[PDB]
């Protein structure tokens, strides 16, 4: 199951970069730290808290309309 | 050289979800498997190369045991005895790919194709002979 | 990769000689290339000869050799023509329909937009061809704006007056209100805007939105923009309902909007509705009583110009709550009493060019007369609505068509909505004129309103007309009738109260001379639309089609609240004027 | 390749040769029936050759330019493709922790910084209305990130501090609605 | 291949061939008829294989020599660009101080590393954290390389202005920390 975790972490950091979050040096540095931590982790529970931590960064912005994107 | 210090980073690397799903449907990437993802496209912060140059930091002025080193040179010289070489003129060079970068003060204007094909063979030979003194 | 503009068949071939580069199926593109001078076809990569130092680009002369294109000379031994078998080789070749007649597409893609027949065909062709013609017309207009020469500030004679030096080799655009310039200031290695300007003959008098202390080196250029391709039809297919759909009418309404209540109901009875509001009939009142009648409805008020949207906002401040109204402003001073750049309120006021992608319960498009099919397509693309209400008068002035030189544009050819209003008749009509005296109302009703416009006021006995040719003098881009100004002078001396009137003329130079001699406020008929005055003095100044146009004369004479004096040069409209004739002194 | 005139020439030649064989007439006459027959391939084996080359060669050109078309429109829609792929994967993962915040974000609740995982650090979460406050904030506790955060501060959108118990049903329409709640992890 | 001098040889040979074949005189006279055209079709083979192989070689020679011309033009382009870059970059040399030092050399040779250490009129320092900033660039002016330098401008990794009052111990964690500070050689 951790494979899905790492894959979605990869995609999430990809979309974060394409949202030009890199223009904030410290924010991008922390996100890169979180990504490198997830891919190197070996236990599944730590991965979940790290990925939600770095997803909070995405959800704090206003450049991705979540309600339209959550079409179910 | 410039008035600002540029900062370079790395990109996360892209994910092929189609092959991943096809693999998972084939009983892969499950728990307790001797096969597991251990190769990835990691990312870096705005300080990567400057965090790699402090690895050239690890080099120190070193003396070697001189007589032992001379004898080692003599013995190593034999492992390259079957080979042959020497200088060649500008007509005998063979280049794998010409579309590769040249360098700082050249990349700004073109690629190595342009420089090999702008100057003649005589100019190349002249530069080669210039570098010998 | 796209769809045929004539077949809707998927195809990735675009004509390289067309300015808009429309996707054309193999059969359609073949017919277009063989029947017109357009010999360039663009694909994922252009159909051009890949020979080093070759200029061949005619697709009828090219062959697919190797993985490339070549002419006869440069072709490799094994190749086939791209343009053969009545088709041009391309993509989705098996899935192709073709067209029996491509004459309309050829005419639209080959016309120079200088004939009235071009616009007539554009409004009478197919909807996809309507969008193609609108794109071509607006791109041609934008390109033609570039053909003019840059005017640079040589000398600053005074404030509001300038001296301009014109570029050699390029024509000088006319100095009127229909050509808005923008000023650029001299900097080190780039240029900066200093706002938008308009110019008139002084030396030249400049009217700027923002006042500066501009100096020598600043110049002015008519700003152009990118013309985006159109996908949405000018009109969504009509649907008529048996009950009011998506609307809940209020159970308590005031008498001020009572005369519209049942009419408002028909707004919810059909998918889109069209309104003809003669001057002084309460078009904005209708638009806002629609909101008050359906207080839970989500409404997008939109118009082409900022002034109409500002008028709608001014009415909204009068009747609509300020917290539920917001004005969209792109990143020109406009309405700034509603919150700026809010999309999710209950009432959004915006221009056509700045409309966000959103859904509404009702979309009200005010003053349909100035609209073009491009605006209709943009509105239909940005706004998804249960109901649309098109408000405006085909009897009023349309959008100016600069490239038009031959023929006159009839009101049925202004746009799709105007065409519907002038062929099948408007779904809604405001038949009571509260603005003009009964003489003016009767005149306009017998002129363009088919004797359907009724006067709320009685005859004021202050509507006068005079038949006086005068002397017509011409400037670079306008006309002047000084003897008519002298007649107005004599009338003012013999009637000093008329010094509170506003002088209206169809020519800007005529307005300049009238302001320099009479001192009265001066207005062009095009600018006067949307305004009202107590007393009006109008001089035709010519007998040309511009000054004799029925819509323009309607707009000019409907600006008066009490009295109007018409110094008329055309005998026809003078006899049509139901005014009290006066003798020349 | 059966729709070519040279196919008809081949058919005529072969019929003549078959008649010659079933007849056995002469030895020079059937030579003229093969002097003008084996050539009938010499003008049939090549007109059926360059067109056959053209068939597959055009095919290889159009498929490759299809491939470049797919490569050029593929990279023109990345900003939506990756984000849809991401959210499909997110919804597939089915974890309560991410689901809580994804619903909170879709309705009213987004943090103003990275949510910390230490038990000491601070978070600021915006509450738009009182309805989301009902679900999330219950007294001094704040349920978020599948965790509890003690409330030590809540301030409305015009920077005026407001105490905890001040908020309720009917007095809620008295404050700048986009509240920001400061909380500390338990 | 229709404007070749022998195309008339086909004309005459096949015209006579068809004429005497439709006439049908005899084989004794048809031998010369069917041998003249036989040697003719070979004549064309010679004088056509001598031509149709020439266009490919001429065409490829034009391709090669055209691309040679293009390369030669690019050579002039890069020559101009390189020389103008040298001349524009030399104009910054600040030709007063460097002359003083080079006059002081025994032969004129000076190690390159001291040219920007003694003659360069600007300094930029990159600082990783406030602690090291205190030791080097504290205050509105500092010293280095046996010279006094005065601060004018400070930015962060995001290349935005940050004021000297903003760099404190407590405010530090709110800044990007490859800080850039530029100073001018005071005199
Ligand atoms: Zn078609
Ligand atoms: Zn065309
Ligand atoms: Zn060519």
From Swiss-Prot, chain A:
Task: Give the result of residue 70 to F, as annotated.
Answer: In strain: Theta/P.3 and Zeta/P.2
Q: Identify the domain of life.
A: Viruses
> Which part of the chain is the RdRp Nsp7 cofactor domain?
1-72
Q: Where in the cell is it found?
A: Host cytoplasm, Host perinuclear region; Host cytoplasm; Host endoplasmic reticulum
- Known partners and oligomeric status: Interacts with nsp8 and nsp12 to form the replication-transcription complex (RTC): nsp12, nsp7, two subunits of nsp8, and up to two subunits of nsp13. Eight copies of nsp7 and eight copies of nsp8 assemble to form a heterohexadecamer dsRNA-encircling ring structure.
- What the protein does? Plays a role in viral RNA synthesis. Forms a hexadecamer with nsp8 (8 subunits of each) that may participate in viral replication by acting as a primase. Alternatively, may synthesize substantially longer products than oligonucleotide primers.
Q: List the protein's name.
A: Non-structural protein 7
**Phylogenetic placement of the source organism:** Viruses, Riboviria, Orthornavirae, Pisuviricota, Pisoniviricetes
Whole-protein residues included: 3861 to 3932 of 4405
UniProtKB/Swiss-Prot annotation, chain C:
Binding positions (Zn(2+) 13): 49, 54, 71, 74
Where is each (+)RNA virus helicase C-terminal domain found?
A: 431-585
So where does a ribonucleoside 5'-triphosphate get bound?
Answer: 277-284
Please tell me where Zn(2+) 11 binds in this chain: 4, 7, 25, 28
Q: Where are the LRR repeats?
A: 223-243
Mutating residue 333 to D: what's the consequence?
Answer: In strain: Gamma/P.1
| Localization of this protein | Host endoplasmic reticulum-Golgi intermediate compartment
Q: How does it assemble?
A: Interacts with nsp8 to form the replication-transcription complex (RTC): nsp12, nsp7, two subunits of nsp8, and up to two subunits of nsp13. Interacts with host TBK1; this interaction inhibits TBK1 phosphorylation and decreases by 75% IRF3 phosphorylation, which leads to reduced IFN-beta production.
UniProt name for this protein? Helicase nsp13
Which organism is this protein's natural source?
Severe acute respiratory syndrome coronavirus 2
Curated annotation (Swiss-Prot), chain D:
Entry's localization field: Host cytoplasm, Host perinuclear region; Host cytoplasm; Host endoplasmic reticulum
Originating species: Severe acute respiratory syndrome coronavirus 2 (2019-nCoV)
What function is annotated for this protein?
Answer: Plays a role in viral RNA synthesis. Forms a hexadecamer with nsp7 (8 subunits of each) that may participate in viral replication by acting as a primase. Alternatively, may synthesize substantially longer products than oligonucleotide primers. Interacts with ribosome signal recognition particle RNA (SRP). Together with NSP9, suppress protein integration into the cell membrane, thereby disrupting host immune defenses.
Q: Subunit structure, per the record? A: Interacts with nsp7, nsp13 and nsp12 to form the replication-transcription complex (RTC): nsp12, nsp7, two subunits of nsp8, and up to two subunits of nsp13. Eight copies of nsp7 and eight copies of nsp8 assemble to form a heterohexadecamer dsRNA-encircling ring structure.
Stretch list, region Disordered: 1-73
Superkingdom classification of source: Viruses
Stated name of the protein = Non-structural protein 8
Residue limits of the RdRp Nsp8 cofactor domain? 1-186
Q: What is the effect of changing residue 113 to S?
A: In strain: Omicron/BA.2.75
């Amino acid at each position: 199951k951790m494979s899905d975790v790492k894959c979605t972490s990869v995609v999430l950091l990809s979309v974060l970069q394409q949202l030009r979050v890199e223009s904030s040096s410290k924010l991008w540095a922390q996100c890169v730290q979180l990504h490198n931590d997830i891919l190197l982790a070996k236990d599944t529970t730590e991965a979940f808290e790290k990925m939600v931590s770095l997803l909070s960064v995405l959800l704090s912005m206003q450049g991705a309309v979540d309600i339209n994107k959550l079409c179910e | 050289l410039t008035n600002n210090v540029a900062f370079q980073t790395v990109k996360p690397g892209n994910f092929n979800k189609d092959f991943y799903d096809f693999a998972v449907s084939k009983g892969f990437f499950k728990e307790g498997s001797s096969v597991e993802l251990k190769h990835f496209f990691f990312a870096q912060d705005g300080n990567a190369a400057i965090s790699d140059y402090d690895y050239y930091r690890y080099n120190l002025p070193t003396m070697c045991d001189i007589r032992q080193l001379l004898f080692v040179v003599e013995v190593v010289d034999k492992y390259f005895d079957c080979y042959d070489g020497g200088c060649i003129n500008a007509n005998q060079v063979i280049v794998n790919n010409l579309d590769k970068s040249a360098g700082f003060p050249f990349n700004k204007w073109g690629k190595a194709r342009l420089y090999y094909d702008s100057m003649s063979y005589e100019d190349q030979d002249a530069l080669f002979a210039y570098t010998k003194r | 990769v796209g769809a045929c503009v004539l077949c809707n068949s998927q195809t990735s071939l675009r004509c390289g000689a067309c300015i808009r580069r429309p996707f054309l199926c193999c059969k359609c593109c073949y017919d277009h290339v063989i029947s017109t001078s357009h010999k360039l076809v663009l694909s994922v990569n252009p159909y051009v000869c890949n020979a080093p130092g070759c200029d061949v680009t005619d697709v009828t002369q090219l062959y697919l050799g190797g993985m490339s294109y070549y002419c006869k000379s440069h072709k490799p031994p094994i190749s086939f023509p791209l343009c053969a078998n009545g088709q041009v080789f391309g993509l989705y070749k098996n899935t192709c329909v073709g067209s029996d007649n491509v004459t309309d597409f050829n005419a639209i893609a080959t016309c120079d937009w200088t004939n009235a027949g071009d616009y007539i065909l554009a409004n009478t062709c197919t909807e996809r061809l309507k969008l193609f013609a609108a794109e071509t017309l607006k791109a041609t207009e934008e390109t033609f704006k570039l053909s003019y020469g840059i005017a640079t500030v040589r000398e600053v004679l005074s404030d509001r007056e300038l001296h301009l030096s014109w570029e050699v080799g390029k024509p000088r655009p006319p100095l009127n209100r229909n050509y808005v310039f923008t000023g650029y200031r001299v900097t080190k290695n780039s240029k900066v805007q200093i706002g938008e300007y308009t110019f008139e003959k002084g030396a030249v008098v400049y009217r700027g939105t923002t006042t500066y202390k501009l100096n020598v080196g600043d110049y002015f250029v008519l700003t152009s923009h990118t013309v985006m391709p159109l996908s949405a039809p000018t009109l969504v297919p009509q649907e008529h309902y048996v009950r009011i759909t998506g609307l809940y009418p209020t159970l308590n309404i005031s008498d001020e909007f009572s005369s519209n209540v049942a009419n408002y109901q028909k707004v919810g009875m059909q998918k889109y509705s069209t309104l003809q509001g003669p001057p002084g009939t309460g078009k904005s009142h209708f638009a806002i009583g629609l909101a008050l009648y359906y207080p839970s409805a989500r409404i997008v008020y939109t118009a082409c110009s900022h002034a109409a949207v500002d008028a709608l906002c001014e009415k909204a401040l009068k009747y609509l709550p300020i917290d539920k109204c917001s004005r969209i402003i792109p990143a020109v001073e406009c309405f700034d009493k509603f919150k700026v750049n809010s999309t999710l309120e209950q009432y959004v006021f915006c221009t056509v060019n700045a409309l966000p992608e959103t859904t509404a319960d009702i979309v009200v498009f005010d003053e349909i007369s100035m609209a073009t099919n491009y605006d209709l397509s943009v509105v239909n693309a940005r706004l998804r609505a249960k109901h649309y209400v098109y408000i405006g008068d085909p009897a009023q002035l349309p959008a100016p068509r600069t490239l038009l030189t031959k023929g006159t544009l009839e009101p049925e050819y202004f746009n799709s909505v105007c065409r519907l209003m002038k062929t099948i008749g408007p779904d809604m009509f405001l038949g009571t004129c509260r603005r003009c005296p009964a003489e003016i109302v009767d005149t306009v009703s017998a002129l363009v309103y088919d004797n359907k416009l009724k006067a709320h006021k009685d005859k004021s006995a202050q509507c006068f007309k005079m038949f006086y040719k005068g002397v017509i003098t011409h400037d670079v881009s306008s006309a002047i009738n000084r003897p008519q100004i002298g007649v107005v002078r004599e009338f003012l001396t013999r009637n000093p109260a008329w010094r509170k009137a506003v002088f209206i003329s169809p020519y800007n130079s005529q307005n300049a001379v009238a302001s320099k001699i009479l001192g009265l406020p001066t207005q062009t008929v095009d600018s006067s639309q949307g305004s009202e005055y107590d007393y009006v003095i109008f001089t035709q100044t010519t007998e040309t089609a511009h000054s004799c146009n029925v819509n323009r004369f309607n707009v000019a004479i409907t600006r008066a609240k009490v009295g109007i004096l018409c110094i008329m040069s055309d005998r026809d409209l003078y006899d049509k004027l139901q005014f009290t004739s006066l003798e020349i002194p | 390749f059966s729709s070519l005139p040279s196919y008809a020439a081949f058919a005529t030649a072969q019929e003549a040769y078959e008649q010659a064989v079933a007849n056995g007439d002469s030895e020079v006459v059937l030579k003229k029936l093969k002097k003008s027959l084996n050539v009938a391939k010499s003008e049939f084996d090549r007109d059926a050759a360059m067109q056959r080359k053209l068939e597959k060669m055009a095919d290889q050109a159009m498929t490759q330019m299809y491939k470049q078309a797919r490569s050029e429109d593929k990279r023109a829609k990345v900003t939506s493709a990756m984000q849809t792929m991401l959210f499909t994967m997110l919804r597939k993962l089915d974890n309560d922790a991410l689901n809580n915040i994804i619903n909170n974000a879709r309705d009213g609740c987004v943090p103003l910084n990275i949510i910390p995982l230490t038990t000491a650090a601070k978070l600021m979460v915006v509450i738009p209305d009182y309805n989301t406050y009902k679900n999330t904030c219950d007294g001094t506790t704040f349920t978020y990130a599948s965790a509890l955060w003690e409330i030590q501060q809540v301030v409305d959108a015009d920077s005026k501090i407001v105490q905890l118990s001040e908020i309720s049903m009917d007095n809620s329409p008295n404050l700048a609605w986009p509240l920001i709640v400061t909380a500390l992890r338990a």
